[PDB]
Amino acid sequence: MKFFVQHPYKERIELNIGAITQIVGQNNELKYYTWQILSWYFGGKKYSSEDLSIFDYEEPTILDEAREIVKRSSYHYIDISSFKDLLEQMEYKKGTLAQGYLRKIVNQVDIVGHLEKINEQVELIEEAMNRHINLNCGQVEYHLENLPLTLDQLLTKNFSPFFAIENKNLSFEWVSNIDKLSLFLEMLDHLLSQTTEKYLIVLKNIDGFISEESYTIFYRQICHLVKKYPNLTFILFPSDQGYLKIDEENSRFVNILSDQVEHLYDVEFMYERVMKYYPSNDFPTREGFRMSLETVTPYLLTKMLRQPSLSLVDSVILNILNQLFHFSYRIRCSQTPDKELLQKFLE
Amino acid sequence: MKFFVQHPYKERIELNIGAITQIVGQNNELKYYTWQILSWYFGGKKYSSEDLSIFDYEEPTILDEAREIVKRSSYHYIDISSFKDLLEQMEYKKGTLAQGYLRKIVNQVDIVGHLEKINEQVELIEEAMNRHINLNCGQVEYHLENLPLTLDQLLTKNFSPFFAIENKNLSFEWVSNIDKLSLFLEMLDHLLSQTTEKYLIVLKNIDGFISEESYTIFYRQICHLVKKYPNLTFILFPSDQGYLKIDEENSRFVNILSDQVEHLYDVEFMYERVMKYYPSNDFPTREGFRMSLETVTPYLLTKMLRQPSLSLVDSVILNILNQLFHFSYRIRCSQTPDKELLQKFLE
Amino acid sequence: MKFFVQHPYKERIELNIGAITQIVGQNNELKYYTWQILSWYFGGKKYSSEDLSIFDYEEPTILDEAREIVKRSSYHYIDISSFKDLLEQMEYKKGTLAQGYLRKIVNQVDIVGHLEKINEQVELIEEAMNRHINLNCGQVEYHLENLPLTLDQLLTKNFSPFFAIENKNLSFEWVSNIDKLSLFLEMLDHLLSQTTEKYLIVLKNIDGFISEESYTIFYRQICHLVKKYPNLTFILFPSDQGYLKIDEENSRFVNILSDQVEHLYDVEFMYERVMKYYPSNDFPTREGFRMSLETVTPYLLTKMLRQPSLSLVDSVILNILNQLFHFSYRIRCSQTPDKELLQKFLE
Amino acid sequence: MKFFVQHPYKERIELNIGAITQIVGQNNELKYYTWQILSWYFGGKKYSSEDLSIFDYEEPTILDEAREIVKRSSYHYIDISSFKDLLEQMEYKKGTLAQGYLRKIVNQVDIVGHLEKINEQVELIEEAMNRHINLNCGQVEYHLENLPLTLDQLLTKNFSPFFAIENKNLSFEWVSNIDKLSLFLEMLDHLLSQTTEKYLIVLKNIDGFISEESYTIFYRQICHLVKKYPNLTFILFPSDQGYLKIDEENSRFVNILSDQVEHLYDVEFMYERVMKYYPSNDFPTREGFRMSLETVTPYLLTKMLRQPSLSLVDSVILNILNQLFHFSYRIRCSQTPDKELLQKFLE
Ligand SMILES: [Mg+2]
Ligand SMILES: [Mg+2]
Ligand SMILES: [Mg+2]
């Protein structure tokens, strides 16, 4: 689908949303603004008047393709912009993933029984207690009444999460970053297996905390989950290099936010178009193209002050792609002397 | 015990203190002053300049029979000037009687043992959850650890005191006034059984809120409590009519604060001193005399502008009693020639 | 007018209300209950369910003569059941007499001007402050904005009441009880002189704190105020002896609450009736009757266990009055020997 | 300065610390660890067992060049990992920069003097009120006394900070990201002018939220601040592309954390060492070299599975630089026979 995000003074920011959505581009401020609105809109933000200033004290809106309003309640929104947010989703508090997950687990005839036995010891502590505080005068009596215990209450006050390696506890912070994400995704998995409600999960700032190899592991996991839970949607904000993943399925949901806003087309479609414009008969392979596309996309639709360092082939693809979007920027042929020598030296 | 209470301009106010001390008399202002000093002195009042101004900015003192200072810490003071005061003493808050009694009981096997079970049951819930909880990534395992459930936690979040008649709660305000008083005394009984430290309880304004019949019930209860606990002392401020109690054991502590200060003596002793001046050879029985005392005492040592309405017998006894205290005031024979017809009218 | 106060299980308590209303009687519990409802009803009490228990969880009501509901907002209610309540009415807080009074005083072109000068020094402190915290970056600026001062604010935080004698401050508590009442009435006077809204003031527990002479001074003051402010109403709960004031104007508003509830009739009406029943030709003077009526009224409609000590004449009037209310109780002729001697001795 | 940061299983992590220190490189996890320890060690973290488990329950340490412990108190730490962190440093709350600067200023004649006037004006309001206030009874007088209005009271109840553009307030979130950073630095400037104590400021994750152009502005500002204040130290964690700055003065403090740890050297020095192995006699100018460094450095000391896309010149320089650090990885000449047609395509 599509999100048409309200902008304080310009047209709406268009976003082509899919199971796995990726927002990239050189316009970092705009990306940030888009993230701020998204989290506020779907996150339950209670707006102050200073928050609505830029929108003329009117609450900001997000429209769909038909230009209808996308309800703020439309998704079970989870924002992960730091590992701290991740730890918070695994603690038993109001609205966290853990709350919904642990409530499903605790709910079992097996456990419920222990609650009854616990409330029996309570009813005993009460009685044995009233026997010593015999405040009775006529028809009147002064005594303590007990509010029976609930599991929600127990989970909220007497239980805490811990992480261990072969039974040795270590703080969440010291848990490997990739493991942090995996544990979170696993919890999300078990929860989604018992709900049809829509879940929208936003992830930014993580690329910098894990290697390109670990990220690939994390990305396969989210791909697995979206293919398993139709009701799940991911919105990622990949770094400029080594994290953006492009394939036939998610291609159209790669949104480029630079000097202009556009989303990619289908890969096969673009391959053929680009191939038609390629200045050589030695067309790149579909895979070589796909990778070139992953490298350059973050730099499309951007008139740049400094030419990004790129291979000859990626520079060409970049130029051609820009043209397909009618964007004028072009990487100009390097002006370095004795290229033959540098080339040979790289042999 | 003798209390020589400091007065802003005259000689100290002499009070004869006993287990059940009663302050009665027509000098309402002096009585009010005495109560004020008593509650400030023993109530741990923190004096301000304004407070001490009437004393030359020096802290006031109460001296004993030997002219020594009666330490402000010698008693656990409890001022009952309204029913709201009784209630505060029964709410479980640091400093109250209920709270102090609760402490010397909540920590006793009879209950501490049940905690074992409650917590053992918690460890069982933790184990059952950790089995169904299946979040392992790499060598990391996510699990919940229980935090032992304490008694204080139980009392705070799962216990609330209530006033009820046959399991039907009602606000303290609706509990009959005599019962409010009885509950307070039973509470006090419990607490005193656990300590030998001295307690001084001041009661004022309660007379107007209960029947004379009820007060008798209340009076006997405190008479009991005082017999049972030598460390308990009561200071009452009875109304002019129907509340003052004169008996062989407390008469000595009935203080009259009117135009002059004075305490009563041994009942039999007064009975004999008064009969020496009685106008008839047919004396009132000791019981009748004792009854007149309770009626007349609040009006002794008072030069009254408006002669009080009293039966013929009480008036004579009032006069003789003032004489024995070398007080001038005498009730003047209101002679009416139809005396015979009125009496015949009283069947 | 009339107040028909709701009772948990019996007919409504009837009260004949007038400028100066007096509630007396031997049924102290009922008097107390009536007071509790009155203060809750007109005092703005927010009812808990335990409060409404006795009324079947339905809010209690007070009806007028026509049996219509008397609005809880109908009066500016002030409850004085202790000198502490009096001090509280003289402090500047939400809803106290002082708040309404000081707001009228502070409101003067003369004072308002000093507020402006104060806000000018504020506007200066702000500027001189922003000059040192020059947080300015582009069109943006970070600075402190001032919320201008208000007198209500000043009165609430920088002003406090004090009581002095020839410029020497003493705490309110040490101020003579009669003075406490006088100062309060004076403040009430100045306030009422600038409002037509109805004021209902309830006073109980004070009789015990001042002499009969002082009370007379206080009573003349309230009589002055009700004759000056048609919109003012007083409800007093006098003690059984020496405080109840009866005259032609307030007679009908003296409500007797004992084994039964009735209000007195007009004085001249009762004088004639009683005179018709008097067992002698030596009828008492209208004044002698009025005083006898002040003495006995608190004991009417009361079957008593112990005969109250009264003069022969007051006992007769008491008996006759009871009969006029069809109440059976009767003081029986004393059985004391040699009354002639006791009478002579009183000469 | 040298930091030898403790590592759970390998040799300490060596960091070359300078006024503007930069940590870059492909080992995202190691970098994340380093940031974590730095903020815990200097941020006054209170360690728990779980926290210290990876260290054998011993508190981790940072050693200097002489193997001595760098005290955890040697710096006033400020961790900027998000914009919310900048804001907290600008809210007036004990511990922040704004609060610390406010203190060293609010107490300076320029303002203290205006207080004189404000209060003098209060005494005038008190006098004017005490005249119109007319409550005297007996020798008692009721009057109001003012409590001096302090600066702290003014700031607390009559002052609130605001972000605004031409007197129009807006939420911190809507202030352009580059401005958020500038405001923070101006604040920091003010505070540093008032102290010589050492400050260590860590910045992470900001690159992705602002343009490369803006960051340059930001970088020059901190370059200024550091020149102005020898007690200020910055530790940045730049993205792989477009943020790392290499100059004559800070190059020495650019730390590369990848497969190996290492810091760069004097720029000219490297320029000469690299030109000794350059394949062409036509060397890149010092400026060009310096430009390649900023591009290539984040990828040094890394055995990459996916060869990075780089211009021909940057690739050669990358290779030589790895050689000079005795690191094996070399970028392999991606030869394509149509090399000529592609270049001609790049105009
Ligand atoms: Mg970028
Ligand atoms: Mg009296
Ligand atoms: Mg009575």
Ligand SMILES: [Mg+2]
């Ligand atoms: Mg990387």
